[PDB]
Amino acid sequence: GSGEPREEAGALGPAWDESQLRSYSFPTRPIPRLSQSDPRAEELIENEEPVVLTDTNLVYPALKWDLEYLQENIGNGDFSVYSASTHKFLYYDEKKMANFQNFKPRSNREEMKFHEFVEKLQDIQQRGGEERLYLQQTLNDTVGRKIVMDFLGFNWNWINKQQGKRGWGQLTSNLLLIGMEGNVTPAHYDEQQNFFAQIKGYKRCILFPPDQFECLYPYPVHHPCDRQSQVDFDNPDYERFPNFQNVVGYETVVGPGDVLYIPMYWWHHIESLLNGGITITVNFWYKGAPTPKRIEYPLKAHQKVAIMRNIEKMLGEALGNPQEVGPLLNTMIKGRYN
Amino acid sequence: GSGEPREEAGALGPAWDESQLRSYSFPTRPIPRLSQSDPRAEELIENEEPVVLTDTNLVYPALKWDLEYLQENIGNGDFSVYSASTHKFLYYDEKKMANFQNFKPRSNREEMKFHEFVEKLQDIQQRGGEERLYLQQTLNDTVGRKIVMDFLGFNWNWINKQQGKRGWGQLTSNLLLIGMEGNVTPAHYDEQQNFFAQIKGYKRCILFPPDQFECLYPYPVHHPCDRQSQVDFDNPDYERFPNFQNVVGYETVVGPGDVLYIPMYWWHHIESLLNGGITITVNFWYKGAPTPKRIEYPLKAHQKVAIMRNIEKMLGEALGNPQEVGPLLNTMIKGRYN
């Protein structure tokens, strides 16, 4: 489980309840929820382990954000809005679809203005339709004046010190995430460090450390769903994915004002609570620190993941066709290493 | 089969008969036996396919070699002599034994003078012992005067033109091979081009092209038996090595004066005929031509073999321990590419 639902101040009762969580096959234990001043919080971040920080004020000026405020102020730029007829919004790279022409995505991307996203959301809620939307858009220069001021008001002092102390590279982007209740982002890992800043509503975050690679079966590197798990968490195929019977998660529910550190290479499954209304999040993606000058043995799990990715990339290049990677790997191992 | 036993000139009858060949599980077809002036012979060599050349005179001055002549003239250098209690002389690299301390070789190397090899051979034949010897020694500067003159008398004109026409690199060595009847060198491939010059007695040569990698199951690259087949040809384990049921060989028996082109990366199994007396061979190992400037796709089998070897070498280095190569490869493929 996630830990008991937090009781909201002013006696407003449990923020959420367990009936709002989807049911899965694996056990979990809770991610610690700590003050940013707690030395244990700094210890977790330094060791690249997840922690929920409850009091960073990282996106304090955004906590007033809702669809009306954003529509009035976020400007007239384009926003990427994914549409799906399922609750699962499985990420895929459009640029890799050529490699796998039999891959038929279950979500589609549409570019629209923010007011068109709000209108489409209202159309769906009015007709009781089953269509689902997930807006996922990096923040950029087109945002209006008040959003700029809100952004400038983030706690750059706190997060700049984190970047510096951890040796991270540049902030590459901030993804604005606006989802419908029940939306799910299936398990994947990212190759950047992430401070995940919850703004509105509640998201259940289930994390798995990099040493559970063997249990989570990422797609081939050249597949559009590179870095995502092949396992259907709602109907796990234990014949193809037997070590998913061994997966163990680290779980929490973040709400407004919480910040989850999702360390680079950690798997994460994210869901907007059932019947919890819309969710809003802004993430902070940083490039990881460079490879160290001296390598220490034996290697860490994330180092072996980096090696495996590079082997797949190099073979795809050397063989001239990413579809030849699997046959070559099988030829190498069968009756030799297995 | 190998083709009908050749009838020796002067009505001396079949050089050998099929009862002198060991029995194996796979079919074969014959390697062509051609004159060096036959354009088909040049076509095979150019295409890196095996051919037996019957009339090169490559080692004509060595055809008079026997143990008495060699003992009198080959000098007082050290010769590597392998000893085994089995007919199989499986090659292994002594320098890799540290990586695999549970590998217990069935043959042992002893350095001795040539007259000590002749004496040990006679001791064994006198007592009817079962010990087997295989002398395997690169020719070098210590050889006596008459061997130098014989060596100078090899057909350098013919083989120098082959080296030049094929773009090969340097002659790296000439291995002198003196075996007892029934000795077997188990299936392996070498990373050099080879003109295999038979001098005394008869050797059955069974070759397999590089695209039968999948059927012949080489040891891991870091194992002492790198490049040798794991399959016991005398008792093939089809549960571990199922595609050995699909292997198909190219077979011949070479005798005095014959030269077999064994192309780089071609598997070869070599046996000295049962009840045929001692065998003497000298090989000619040349470095292969460089990788071409422009790569053509799809790649050839030998190019994929080169890639696989390099992947195994790089992983052994990057992981810091060659024993971690198999576990990483399995983690990469299971439920992802298999």
Binding site: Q136, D190, R227, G288, I307 | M314, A318
Partner: peptide, 18 residues
């Protein structure tokens, strides 16, 4: 060199490149 080549991290995240 080979070791550092194989250890090099990418920077890919779940956001569609244009």
């Amino acid at each position: 060199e080979v070791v550092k080549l194989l250890l090099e991290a990418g920077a890919d995240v779940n956001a569609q490149d244009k």
